[PDB]
Tab-separated table of C-alpha atoms and ligand atoms in Angstrom:
chain	number	residue	atom	x	y	z
A	15	UNK	CA	110.693	79.167	96.009
A	16	UNK	CA	108.076	81.193	97.910
A	17	UNK	CA	110.584	83.968	98.627
A	18	UNK	CA	111.652	84.111	94.972
A	19	UNK	CA	108.076	84.182	93.668
A	20	UNK	CA	107.336	86.976	96.151
A	21	UNK	CA	110.316	89.072	95.051
A	22	UNK	CA	109.346	88.673	91.404
A	23	UNK	CA	105.739	89.649	92.151
A	24	UNK	CA	106.969	92.826	93.858
A	25	UNK	CA	109.306	93.667	90.966
A	26	UNK	CA	106.390	93.262	88.556
A	27	UNK	CA	104.151	95.454	90.721
A	28	UNK	CA	106.811	98.176	90.835
A	29	UNK	CA	107.566	98.124	87.116
A	30	UNK	CA	103.861	98.255	86.205
A	31	UNK	CA	103.291	101.244	88.501
A	32	UNK	CA	106.410	102.992	87.191
A	33	UNK	CA	105.303	102.406	83.573
A	34	UNK	CA	101.889	103.933	84.339
A	35	UNK	CA	103.412	107.017	85.958
A	36	UNK	CA	106.064	107.488	83.276
A	37	UNK	CA	103.357	107.512	80.589
A	38	UNK	CA	101.393	110.197	82.460
A	39	UNK	CA	104.427	112.145	83.709
A	40	UNK	CA	103.368	111.663	87.324
A	41	UNK	CA	106.275	112.522	89.599
A	42	UNK	CA	107.213	109.682	91.923
A	43	UNK	CA	109.884	108.800	94.471
A	44	UNK	CA	110.146	105.185	95.665
A	45	UNK	CA	112.997	104.054	97.927
A	46	UNK	CA	113.665	100.382	98.624
A	47	UNK	CA	115.415	99.824	101.940
A	48	UNK	CA	118.307	97.332	101.803
A	49	UNK	CA	120.933	96.558	104.462
A	50	UNK	CA	121.128	100.081	105.870
A	51	UNK	CA	118.135	100.632	108.124
A	52	UNK	CA	115.959	103.621	107.265
A	53	UNK	CA	113.619	103.646	110.239
A	54	UNK	CA	114.391	107.301	110.916
A	55	UNK	CA	113.120	108.317	107.478
A	56	UNK	CA	110.171	105.906	107.531
A	57	UNK	CA	109.014	107.577	110.736
A	58	UNK	CA	108.714	110.961	108.995
A	59	UNK	CA	105.937	109.673	106.719
A	60	UNK	CA	102.414	108.313	106.980
A	61	UNK	CA	102.526	104.683	108.210
A	62	UNK	CA	101.044	102.118	105.821
A	63	UNK	CA	102.754	98.735	106.355
A	64	UNK	CA	100.783	97.689	103.289
A	65	UNK	CA	101.015	94.868	100.799
A	66	UNK	CA	102.637	95.954	97.544
A	67	UNK	CA	100.431	96.255	94.481
A	68	UNK	CA	100.797	98.285	91.310
A	69	UNK	CA	97.371	99.737	92.093
A	70	UNK	CA	98.304	101.029	95.535
A	71	UNK	CA	101.572	102.508	94.277
A	72	UNK	CA	99.694	104.399	91.550
A	73	UNK	CA	97.000	105.632	93.946
A	74	UNK	CA	99.676	106.910	96.348
A	75	UNK	CA	101.391	109.131	93.755
A	76	UNK	CA	98.374	110.786	92.153
A	77	UNK	CA	99.101	114.537	91.965
A	78	UNK	CA	97.489	116.855	94.521
A	79	UNK	CA	96.522	114.079	96.949
A	80	UNK	CA	97.531	113.683	100.607
A	81	UNK	CA	100.157	111.005	99.984
A	82	UNK	CA	101.963	112.121	96.833
A	83	UNK	CA	104.341	114.636	98.503
A	84	UNK	CA	107.455	112.756	99.539
A	85	UNK	CA	108.915	109.300	99.172
A	86	UNK	CA	107.385	105.889	99.476
A	87	UNK	CA	109.760	103.640	101.428
A	88	UNK	CA	109.499	99.871	100.959
A	89	UNK	CA	110.902	97.458	103.545
A	90	UNK	CA	110.576	93.660	103.842
A	91	UNK	CA	108.377	93.420	100.730
A	92	UNK	CA	105.813	95.916	102.025
A	93	UNK	CA	105.136	99.616	101.626
A	94	UNK	CA	106.245	100.836	105.047
A	95	UNK	CA	105.235	104.499	104.713
A	96	UNK	CA	104.433	107.228	102.209
A	97	UNK	CA	105.104	110.968	102.073
A	98	UNK	CA	108.476	110.439	103.751
A	99	UNK	CA	111.293	112.946	104.007
A	100	UNK	CA	114.553	112.133	102.267
A	101	UNK	CA	117.668	114.299	102.588
A	102	UNK	CA	118.556	116.509	99.646
A	103	UNK	CA	121.899	115.912	97.975
A	104	UNK	CA	124.359	118.790	97.711
A	105	UNK	CA	126.242	116.981	94.956
A	106	UNK	CA	127.336	119.400	92.195
A	107	UNK	CA	127.266	116.491	89.711
A	108	UNK	CA	123.534	116.022	89.233
A	109	UNK	CA	122.124	117.216	85.916
A	110	UNK	CA	121.240	120.857	86.450
A	111	UNK	CA	117.748	120.575	84.966
A	112	UNK	CA	116.593	118.191	87.703
A	113	UNK	CA	114.837	119.289	90.856
A	114	UNK	CA	114.225	118.266	94.419
A	115	UNK	CA	112.746	114.807	93.757
A	116	UNK	CA	115.963	113.685	92.111
A	117	UNK	CA	118.163	115.464	94.657
A	118	UNK	CA	116.270	113.692	97.469
A	119	UNK	CA	116.803	110.329	95.760
A	120	UNK	CA	120.526	110.960	95.322
A	121	UNK	CA	120.688	112.280	98.887
A	122	UNK	CA	119.334	109.138	100.522
A	123	UNK	CA	121.571	107.053	98.204
A	124	UNK	CA	124.644	108.866	99.585
A	125	UNK	CA	124.051	107.656	103.167
A	126	UNK	CA	122.357	104.282	102.620
A	127	UNK	CA	122.699	101.277	100.332
A	128	UNK	CA	119.085	101.725	99.226
A	129	UNK	CA	117.794	101.845	95.662
A	130	UNK	CA	115.493	104.733	94.771
A	131	UNK	CA	113.360	104.978	91.632
A	132	UNK	CA	112.344	108.440	90.394
A	133	UNK	CA	109.772	109.383	87.756
A	134	UNK	CA	110.161	112.914	86.417
A	135	UNK	CA	107.028	115.053	86.366
A	136	UNK	CA	108.636	117.100	83.577
A	137	UNK	CA	109.458	114.293	81.133
A	138	UNK	CA	108.203	111.004	82.532
A	139	UNK	CA	111.806	109.847	82.431
A	140	UNK	CA	112.671	107.060	84.851
A	141	UNK	CA	115.893	107.132	86.854
A	142	UNK	CA	117.490	105.231	89.732
A	143	UNK	CA	119.698	106.572	92.524
A	144	UNK	CA	122.229	104.269	94.165
A	145	UNK	CA	125.598	104.905	95.851
A	146	UNK	CA	125.370	108.669	95.227
A	147	UNK	CA	124.837	108.372	91.470
A	148	UNK	CA	121.764	108.896	89.339
A	149	UNK	CA	121.185	106.602	86.365
A	150	UNK	CA	118.917	108.457	83.974
A	151	UNK	CA	116.656	107.740	81.007
A	152	UNK	CA	116.092	104.082	81.859
A	153	UNK	CA	114.110	101.697	79.716
A	154	UNK	CA	111.795	99.129	81.272
A	155	UNK	CA	114.380	96.400	80.581
A	156	UNK	CA	117.035	98.490	82.363
A	157	UNK	CA	114.950	99.184	85.471
A	158	UNK	CA	113.995	95.504	85.738
A	159	UNK	CA	117.662	94.492	85.475
A	160	UNK	CA	118.473	96.936	88.275
A	161	UNK	CA	115.728	95.587	90.521
A	162	UNK	CA	116.778	91.987	89.871
A	163	UNK	CA	120.417	92.850	90.517
A	164	UNK	CA	119.486	94.554	93.774
B	181	UNK	CA	92.886	101.192	127.163
B	182	UNK	CA	95.130	100.881	124.078
B	183	UNK	CA	92.213	99.145	122.276
B	184	UNK	CA	89.935	102.117	123.003
B	185	UNK	CA	92.572	104.660	121.971
B	186	UNK	CA	93.182	102.829	118.680
B	187	UNK	CA	89.449	102.794	118.030
B	188	UNK	CA	89.270	106.551	118.604
B	189	UNK	CA	92.154	107.143	116.181
B	190	UNK	CA	90.453	105.005	113.506
B	191	UNK	CA	87.184	106.851	113.978
B	192	UNK	CA	89.059	110.169	113.694
B	193	UNK	CA	90.782	108.979	110.488
B	194	UNK	CA	87.514	107.765	108.955
B	195	UNK	CA	85.569	110.930	109.788
B	196	UNK	CA	88.305	113.225	108.469
B	197	UNK	CA	88.441	111.280	105.194
B	198	UNK	CA	84.655	111.188	104.752
B	199	UNK	CA	84.382	114.912	105.548
B	200	UNK	CA	87.051	115.691	102.932
B	201	UNK	CA	85.434	113.542	100.235
B	202	UNK	CA	81.930	114.867	100.952
B	203	UNK	CA	83.106	118.456	100.449
B	204	UNK	CA	84.714	117.525	97.116
B	205	UNK	CA	81.885	115.245	95.919
B	206	UNK	CA	84.315	112.308	95.794
B	207	UNK	CA	82.263	109.127	95.669
B	208	UNK	CA	83.199	106.624	98.338
B	209	UNK	CA	82.066	103.248	99.668
B	210	UNK	CA	83.580	102.136	102.977
B	211	UNK	CA	82.433	99.023	104.841
B	212	UNK	CA	83.541	98.388	108.420
B	213	UNK	CA	83.505	94.687	109.263
B	214	UNK	CA	81.909	93.846	112.613
B	215	UNK	CA	81.156	90.371	113.998
B	216	UNK	CA	80.054	88.784	110.707
B	217	UNK	CA	83.233	87.963	108.822
B	218	UNK	CA	83.530	89.485	105.359
B	219	UNK	CA	86.412	87.432	104.039
B	220	UNK	CA	84.539	86.356	100.900
B	221	UNK	CA	84.130	89.999	99.882
B	222	UNK	CA	87.587	91.112	101.019
B	223	UNK	CA	89.118	88.456	98.747
B	224	UNK	CA	87.431	89.990	95.679
B	225	UNK	CA	89.450	93.220	95.993
B	226	UNK	CA	93.079	94.313	95.922
B	227	UNK	CA	94.728	93.313	99.233
B	228	UNK	CA	96.174	96.209	101.224
B	229	UNK	CA	96.239	95.082	104.880
B	230	UNK	CA	97.287	98.658	105.584
B	231	UNK	CA	97.268	100.822	108.687
B	232	UNK	CA	94.349	103.239	108.607
B	233	UNK	CA	94.963	106.882	107.828
B	234	UNK	CA	92.692	109.614	106.542
B	235	UNK	CA	95.275	110.249	103.833
B	236	UNK	CA	95.200	106.684	102.516
B	237	UNK	CA	91.397	106.540	102.574
B	238	UNK	CA	91.222	109.758	100.546
B	239	UNK	CA	93.881	108.621	98.054
B	240	UNK	CA	92.032	105.319	97.468
B	241	UNK	CA	88.851	107.022	96.275
B	242	UNK	CA	90.289	109.691	93.961
B	243	UNK	CA	88.284	109.393	90.715
B	244	UNK	CA	89.762	107.575	87.708
B	245	UNK	CA	92.408	105.697	89.731
B	246	UNK	CA	93.041	101.949	90.022
B	247	UNK	CA	91.540	101.592	93.502
B	248	UNK	CA	88.536	103.901	93.427
B	249	UNK	CA	85.828	101.612	91.995
B	250	UNK	CA	84.320	99.214	94.502
B	251	UNK	CA	84.315	99.056	98.267
B	252	UNK	CA	87.039	99.558	100.812
B	253	UNK	CA	86.606	96.966	103.567
B	254	UNK	CA	88.096	97.705	106.974
B	255	UNK	CA	88.907	95.126	109.626
B	256	UNK	CA	89.348	96.811	113.013
B	257	UNK	CA	92.222	99.299	112.590
B	258	UNK	CA	93.283	98.171	109.105
B	259	UNK	CA	92.207	98.735	105.536
B	260	UNK	CA	91.970	95.098	104.483
B	261	UNK	CA	91.275	95.584	100.767
B	262	UNK	CA	90.048	98.097	98.208
B	263	UNK	CA	88.000	97.827	95.012
B	264	UNK	CA	85.946	95.026	96.570
B	265	UNK	CA	82.710	93.572	95.268
B	266	UNK	CA	79.598	93.819	97.432
B	267	UNK	CA	76.181	92.388	96.529
B	268	UNK	CA	73.533	94.784	95.233
B	269	UNK	CA	70.382	95.197	97.299
B	270	UNK	CA	66.967	94.982	95.637
B	271	UNK	CA	65.282	96.803	98.524
B	272	UNK	CA	62.512	99.192	97.392
B	273	UNK	CA	63.511	101.613	100.201
B	274	UNK	CA	66.594	102.817	98.308
B	275	UNK	CA	65.860	106.235	96.812
B	276	UNK	CA	65.423	105.711	93.078
B	277	UNK	CA	67.975	108.360	92.098
B	278	UNK	CA	70.800	106.577	93.950
B	279	UNK	CA	73.379	104.532	92.093
B	280	UNK	CA	75.355	101.380	92.601
B	281	UNK	CA	77.463	102.489	95.597
B	282	UNK	CA	74.353	102.890	97.739
B	283	UNK	CA	72.794	99.657	96.479
B	284	UNK	CA	76.015	97.764	97.216
B	285	UNK	CA	76.139	99.262	100.722
B	286	UNK	CA	72.582	98.241	101.530
B	287	UNK	CA	73.299	94.850	99.949
B	288	UNK	CA	76.195	93.985	102.238
B	289	UNK	CA	74.196	95.355	105.191
B	290	UNK	CA	71.489	92.748	104.511
B	291	UNK	CA	73.843	89.778	104.986
B	292	UNK	CA	76.243	91.112	107.617
B	293	UNK	CA	76.218	93.282	110.746
B	294	UNK	CA	78.724	95.631	109.113
B	295	UNK	CA	78.405	99.403	108.956
B	296	UNK	CA	78.924	100.950	105.525
B	297	UNK	CA	79.462	104.652	104.823
B	298	UNK	CA	78.680	106.087	101.372
B	299	UNK	CA	79.596	109.490	99.947
B	300	UNK	CA	77.510	110.471	96.930
B	301	UNK	CA	79.498	111.737	93.954
B	302	UNK	CA	76.362	113.600	92.868
B	303	UNK	CA	75.554	115.611	95.988
B	304	UNK	CA	78.342	114.991	98.509
B	305	UNK	CA	75.739	113.641	100.898
B	306	UNK	CA	76.878	111.080	103.444
B	307	UNK	CA	74.815	108.006	104.257
B	308	UNK	CA	75.167	104.824	106.294
B	309	UNK	CA	73.792	101.354	105.597
B	310	UNK	CA	73.243	99.016	108.537
B	311	UNK	CA	70.932	96.011	108.860
B	312	UNK	CA	69.242	96.610	105.536
B	313	UNK	CA	68.394	100.277	106.153
B	314	UNK	CA	69.940	103.328	104.508
B	315	UNK	CA	70.174	106.525	106.558
B	316	UNK	CA	70.865	109.557	104.385
B	317	UNK	CA	72.091	113.152	104.625
B	318	UNK	CA	74.075	112.686	107.823
B	319	UNK	CA	75.758	115.589	109.533
B	320	UNK	CA	79.386	115.210	110.539
B	321	UNK	CA	78.255	114.937	114.148
B	322	UNK	CA	75.721	112.195	113.415
B	323	UNK	CA	78.260	110.111	111.514
B	324	UNK	CA	80.816	110.351	114.321
B	325	UNK	CA	78.198	109.422	116.904
B	326	UNK	CA	77.148	106.427	114.794
B	327	UNK	CA	80.755	105.244	114.538
B	328	UNK	CA	81.377	105.782	118.247
B	329	UNK	CA	78.249	103.764	119.073
B	330	UNK	CA	79.265	100.988	116.672
C	695	XY4	C1	106.601	106.550	78.057
C	695	XY4	C2	107.921	105.978	78.825
C	695	XY4	C3	108.402	107.027	79.619
C	695	XY4	N1	107.397	104.643	78.966
C	695	XY4	C4	107.909	103.824	79.852
C	695	XY4	O1	107.366	102.778	80.107
C	695	XY4	N2	109.121	104.240	80.402
C	695	XY4	C5	109.845	103.565	81.403
C	695	XY4	C6	111.142	103.896	81.766
C	695	XY4	C7	111.798	103.152	82.734
C	695	XY4	C8	111.179	102.083	83.334
C	695	XY4	C9	109.902	101.740	82.961
C	695	XY4	C10	109.239	102.467	81.989
C	696	MG	MG1	67.117	112.984	107.205
């Protein structure tokens, strides 16, 4: 159906952008709003309300640019805003070598049902935060399964 | 009115982005649609349909990124698409040292009433193409006045 084709197109756009950033070890933080509304965090960023594309996602996260500092938040199949604030987790159970990008992803996942994708700037490793937990060292197959499950 | 305030915000966003890119010698090609519809050219690019911001305009044009090659086309207060094709002018009044961005800008200006801004990656100079003419080496003040008058 139209809705299904649109969801698959967005999943493909995300995975392509994530693959590009993982290869180049470009740090990234991408939160997908679900049932819990995140308007209050969207409002902290730069409004975009833009169509999703792998190209736009990549251009947002390029290091040392206006938009790369903070989270992209997606809502209703669009990029709602970039450079958004997310709350930092105080969980003592996050791997100690990880920094604020991952703690922000876990933090928003503690108070929403959202799914957040993180690319490490140190390793290019890809992880997902959901329900207060961080799922690390994901393959492409694993991230896709997570997006389809979501 | 709200229409006039939105226009002023878009002009402020455009001028801030152009000023930033000029200082850094970031090549840019930005066409503002007017009364002649540019749908045929918009459809050649990557759709964004995004709210304008100086930050997004800058991020689009960062060298060696997916979106930087080709024109950004704006429709009113939105970035409609990036990496768009524009036709190349054959006018003999284009300085011979100028490259394809300037020739594309004059080209679209010959078949539309649009206003196109170009930042040279060679010199950082700012120019505008309108009605088949290229006006070069604009001050910040002159550009803003041209946009306000448009
Ligand atoms: C060089 C690596 C880091 N290449 C990848 O493509 N990794 C990756 C990990 C999770 C999801 C998608 C891609
Ligand atoms: Mg002059």
